[PDB]
Each structure stands twice: as C-alpha cells, then as structure tokens.
C-alpha cells in the first residue's frame, strides 16, 4: 500500500516523459552513479521501460541534474527538448532554473576535443631505486 500518482496534470506545451522537481524524499537512487538522492536536491525523471525488468513495463526512473546532462544522449534526450520544457521547471525557483539552463543549453553542436601528452623525453642516468627478485 503506497500512495499512487494522481491522474490529473495541467500541461499544453510541456514534456511529460521528462519531469524535474525537488527530491521530496531521499528514497529513490540514481542509476547513472548508483548514489542515493539527497532530499531537496533537484532531480529529474524519464519515462522508459527497464531492460532488466520488462515485467514492470512503463516505469519512471530518477537521475541527478548532473547525471541527466552527461547521460543526455544515452538516455535518449534530443536537442529539440530544453530544460524549460521539463515538467516543473517553471514551478522551480529562478535560481535553480538558471542552474539547469546553464547545463542544458538545448540545441548546440558540441564535439569532442583532444589535448596533448608526454611521449618520453628520457634523460641520462639519474638517481633512482630498483625492485627486488625472489
Ligand atoms: Zn546520479
């Protein structure tokens, strides 16, 4: 016996599958990092079916705002959808809102980048130690 979700939402231009709101309780746990979700800390959910538990079917998971971004592609979040389109965002506080906008700029062509690394640059003999045998 657990209080179920009331069937009666008011939205016209909002995405259902995607919803964001304050973590009412610290019961749920993220799967991207496998870490409990501290109460109060903003959180989001995505309507999808668990591959490990097909019996349940259409379920609702939860992932920290930071995980939602990193796994924005893996989860299946297209650029056509922004943070302002997250059920609840509008309700959230401006301060928090911007926090999500700065993370999910919506449409943007972001590409991977590479830097540099050491090749060797070995020098003449120097003072060092050595392993031991048996
Ligand atoms: Zn997480």
Swiss-Prot record:
<feature type="binding site">
    <location>
        <position position="30"/>
    </location>
    <ligand>
        <name>Zn(2+) 2</name>
    </ligand>
</feature>
<feature type="modified residue" description="Phosphoserine">
    <location>
        <position position="90"/>
    </location>
</feature>
<feature type="region of interest" description="Disordered">
    <location>
        <begin position="103"/>
        <end position="128"/>
    </location>
</feature>
<feature type="modified residue" description="Phosphoserine">
    <location>
        <position position="82"/>
    </location>
</feature>
<protein>
    <recommendedName>
        <fullName>Poly [ADP-ribose] polymerase 1, processed N-terminus</fullName>
    </recommendedName>
</protein>
<feature type="binding site">
    <location>
        <position position="67"/>
    </location>
    <ligand>
        <name>Zn(2+) 2</name>
    </ligand>
</feature>
<feature type="cross-link" description="Glycyl lysine isopeptide (Lys-Gly) (interchain with G-Cter in SUMO1); alternate">
    <location>
        <position position="108"/>
    </location>
</feature>
<feature type="binding site">
    <location>
        <position position="33"/>
    </location>
    <ligand>
        <name>Zn(2+) 2</name>
    </ligand>
</feature>
<feature type="compositionally biased region" description="Basic and acidic residues">
    <location>
        <begin position="109"/>
        <end position="128"/>
    </location>
</feature>
<feature type="modified residue" description="N6-acetyllysine">
    <location>
        <position position="36"/>
    </location>
</feature>
<feature type="short sequence motif" description="Nuclear localization signal">
    <location>
        <begin position="112"/>
        <end position="114"/>
    </location>
</feature>
<feature type="modified residue" description="Phosphoserine">
    <location>
        <position position="84"/>
    </location>
</feature>
<feature type="cross-link" description="Glycyl lysine isopeptide (Lys-Gly) (interchain with G-Cter in SUMO2)">
    <location>
        <position position="97"/>
    </location>
</feature>
<feature type="modified residue" description="N6-acetyllysine">
    <location>
        <position position="10"/>
    </location>
</feature>
<feature type="binding site">
    <location>
        <position position="64"/>
    </location>
    <ligand>
        <name>Zn(2+) 2</name>
    </ligand>
</feature>
<comment type="function">
    <text>This cleavage form irreversibly binds to DNA breaks and interferes with DNA repair, promoting DNA damage-induced apoptosis.</text>
</comment>
<feature type="cross-link" description="Glycyl lysine isopeptide (Lys-Gly) (interchain with G-Cter in SUMO2); alternate">
    <location>
        <position position="108"/>
    </location>
</feature>
<feature type="zinc finger region" description="PARP-type 2">
    <location>
        <begin position="18"/>
        <end position="108"/>
    </location>
</feature>
<feature type="site" description="Cleavage; by caspase-3 and caspase-7">
    <location>
        <begin position="119"/>
        <end position="120"/>
    </location>
</feature>
């Amino acid at each position: 016996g657990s209080s179920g979700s009331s069937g009666g939402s008011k939205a016209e231009k909002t995405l259902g599958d995607f919803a964001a709101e304050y973590a009412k309780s610290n019961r749920s746990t993220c799967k991207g990092c496998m870490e409990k979700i501290e109460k109060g800390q903003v959180r989001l959910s995505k309507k999808m079916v668990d591959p490990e538990k097909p019996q349940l079917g259409m379920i609702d998971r939860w992932y920290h705002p930071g995980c939602f971004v990193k796994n924005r592609e893996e989860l299946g979040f297209r650029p056509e959808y922004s943070a302002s389109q997250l059920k609840g965002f509008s309700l959230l506080a401006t301060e928090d809102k911007e926090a999500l906008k700065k993370q999910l700029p919506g449409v943007k062509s972001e590409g991977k980048r590479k830097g540099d690394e050491v090749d060797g640059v070995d020098e003449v003999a120097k003072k060092k130690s050595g392993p031991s045998s048996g």
